[PDB]
C-alpha cells in the first residue's frame, strides 16, 4: 500500500481479498459467540468458504470477485502465479535488465562484420559505471560522485569525457537484439563503434539473420559486464563467428540483395 508520486495511495488487490476474508471470519466468530441460528451460521460459513476460494483462486468457482464501483475481477494468488502475465513468464523466465538501450537501426556499409555503430549518447549511458571510473582515473573528475554529477547535465560534459569513453569500450562488445528472437542469431555480439547520431548502424550481412531491414526497425543493446560475459560474447556470440545456419548448416551471413546484384 504505497503512496505515489503525488499524495494518493495505491494498493494491490490482495489487500481487498484479505480484508474480506478477515471481515467474514471475524463476523462468523461474533455470530458463533451470540448463538446465532443455523441458517445465519451456515450462510456465514459458506461466505467464509467463498472468501477463501476468491483469495486463493478468484473466478475459478462462481462469478469472479470484483472491486465495488468496477467490473474488473480482483487479482488472486493463482492469477499472480499463472498466465502470460504471471510471475513465471513475466518475472522469472523473462526480466527487464539494466545496462540496456534501444534505438532505430540504419545500414552501415563501412562497418566490419564484427562491428556495429553505437551512438555516443547511448554508449555514455550504457557504459556509465565504467565511464565514471575512467574519468576518475584521468584528470576529468576528482571522484566518481563528481564524475556522475558532471554527466547529469548535457552542457557540463567536456570533450575529454568522449575520449575516455572510447578507452572504456576498447575491446568490449555489446549484444544487438531485434524482436521477435525467432532463432538464436536474433541476438549477436558486435564491437561497438562510437558514431555521431542517435541511430544504430547495422552491418548489411547480418540483416538476414536478424530479419532486419531499414524501414523503421528498432534494436536492443545489452552490455555484458564481467570477464565471463565478455568472453562468451566475444568467442561464442560474435557475429563474425556465427556464419553458418545452425538449422541447416548453410551460410547465413552471405551476400544479399545489393551485394548479389553488383556481383
Amino acid at each position: 500500500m504505497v503512496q505515489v508520486d503525488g499524495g494518493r495511495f495505491a494498493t494491490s488487490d490482495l489487500n481487498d481479498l484479505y480484508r474480506r476474508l478477515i471481515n467474514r471470519n471475524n463476523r462468523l466468530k461474533k455470530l458463533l459467540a451470540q448463538g446465532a441460528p443455523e441458517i445465519i451460521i451456515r450462510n456465514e460459513k459458506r461466505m467464509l468458504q467463498e472468501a477463501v476460494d476468491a483469495l486463493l483462486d478468484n473466478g475459478r468457482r462462481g462469478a469472479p470477485v470484483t472491486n465495488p464501483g468496477s467490473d474488473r475481477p480482483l487479482r488472486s494468488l493463482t492469477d499472480i502465479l499463472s498466465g502470460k502475465q504471471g510471475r513465471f513468464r513475466q518475472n522469472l523466465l523473462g526480466k527487464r535488465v539494466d545496462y540496456s538501450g534501444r534505438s532505430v537501426i540504419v545500414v552501415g556499409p563501412q562497418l566490419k562484420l564484427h562491428q556495429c555503430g553505437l551512438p555516443k549518447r547511448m554508449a555514455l549511458e550504457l557504459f556509465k559505471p565504467f565511464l565514471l571510473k575512467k574519468m576518475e582515473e584521468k584528470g576529468i573528475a576528482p571522484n566518481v560522485k563528481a564524475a556522475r554529477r558532471m554527466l547529469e547535465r548535457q552542457r557540463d560534459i567536456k570533450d575529454e569525457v568522449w575520449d575516455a569513453l572510447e578507452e572504456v569500450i576498447h575491446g568490449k562488445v555489446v549484444l544487438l537484439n531485434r524482436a521477435p528472437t525467432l532463432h538464436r542469431l536474433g541476438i549477436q555480439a558486435f564491437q561497438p563503434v562510437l558514431v555521431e547520431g542517435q541511430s544504430i548502424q547495422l552491418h548489411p550481412l547480418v540483416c538476414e539473420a536478424f530479419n532486419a531491414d531499414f524501414d523503421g526497425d528498432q534494436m536492443a543493446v545489452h552490455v555484458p559486464l564481467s570477464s565471463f560475459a565478455q568472453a562468451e560474447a566475444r568467442i561464442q556470440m560474435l557475429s563474425a563467428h556465427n556464419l553458418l545456419s545452425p538449422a541447416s548448416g548453410e551460410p547465413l551471413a552471405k551476400p544479399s540483395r545489393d551485394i548479389i546484384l553488383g556481383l
Binding site: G7, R8, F9, A10, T11, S12, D13, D16, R72, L74
Partner: peptide, 12 residues
Amino acid sequence: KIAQEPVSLETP
C-alpha cells in the same frame, strides 16, 4: 483529500 479511496495496483 481524506475521502480519497486508494487505487488498485492492477488496474489496466
